[PDB]
Design a protein that fits this description.
By secondary structure, the chain is mostly beta strands. It has strands at residues 6-10, 14-18, 23-31, 39-47, 60-65, 71-77, 88-99, 106-108, 113-119. It has a single domain, classed as Immunoglobulin-like (Sandwich). It contains no helices and 9 strands. Bound molecules: calcium ion (4 copies). Ca(2+) 4 binds at residues 55, 81, 85, 88. Residues 4-95 form the Calx-beta domain.
Length: 124
């Protein structure tokens, strides 16, 4: 052993957005190791106190770090409505880190899960 490996993780642990922000942006980071490799990482949302379909969009997919890339941005739609609510949150999970051919070259780091605070923008 004694060789460094790439680490995948969110740039921040918590993100924020007004309910009228349209979409919230999370940044996935890839650090160290051999950056000439192609690395795949899956992402996926989960409900907290905010619910998919009424507060945000169920969003999922896969990010691909091409050689030399150290940062990838992802978007989650925020559903704006006209009703009063508490400030809520949902989760976004990284998983399934794989290296491409042509798994300790690349690993999931910490934080592999980010939280998203949605501030309500309505009165009552
Ligand atoms: Ca709600
Ligand atoms: Ca809402
Ligand atoms: Ca609103
Ligand atoms: Ca609302």
């Amino acid at each position: 052993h004694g060789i460094p490996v790439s680490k995948i993780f969110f740039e921040q642990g918590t993100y924020q957005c007004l309910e009228n922000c349209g979409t919230v942006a999370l940044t996935i980071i890839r650090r160290g190791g051999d950056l000439t490799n192609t690395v795949f990482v899956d992402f996926r949302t989960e409900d907290g106190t905010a619910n998919a379909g009424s507060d945000y969009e169920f969003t999922e997919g896969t990010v691909v770090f091409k050689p030399g890339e150290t940062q990838k941005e992802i978007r989650v739609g925020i559903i704006d409505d006209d009703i009063f609510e508490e400030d809520e949150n949902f989760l976004v999970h990284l998983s399934n880190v794989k290296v491409s051919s042509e798994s300790a070259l690349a690993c999931l780091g910490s934080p592999s899960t980010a939280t998203v605070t949605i501030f309500d923008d309505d009165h009552a």
